[PDB]
Structure formats: structure tokens, C-alpha cells
Amino acid sequence: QQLANYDKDKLSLAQTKARLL
Amino acid sequence: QQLANYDKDKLSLAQTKARLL
Numbered sequence: 317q318q319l320a321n322y323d324k325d326k327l328s329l330a331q332t333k334a335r336l337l
Numbered sequence: 338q339q340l341a342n343y344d345k346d347k348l349s350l351a352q353t354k355a356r357l358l
Contacts, residue, residue, distance in 0.1 A: 319339065325346055332353045
């Protein structure tokens with residue numbers, strides 16, 4: 317019900333941190 | 338449980354969005 321996007325959101329957050337660096 | 342990690346991920350995503358902008 318809520319764990320489907322748990323992976324895609326985490327990955328996208330990782331690449332956003334990449335642009336931040 | 339994992340929902341707390343989800344909430345932390347959402348907060349960090351918002352913070353990264355603000356910092357990136």
C-alpha cells in the first residue's frame with residue numbers, strides 16, 4: 317500500500333544528492 | 338517501522354530539492 321514507491325523515491329533522492337554535490 | 342524511514346526519506350527529499358534550487 318505504501319512500499320511500492322519506497323525504492324523509486326530513494327533512488328531518485330540519491331541522484332538528486334548527486335546533482336547537489 | 339519502514340514508514341518512519343519513508344517519512345525521513347520524504348523530509349530529506351524536500352530538503353535536497355530546496356538546496357538544489
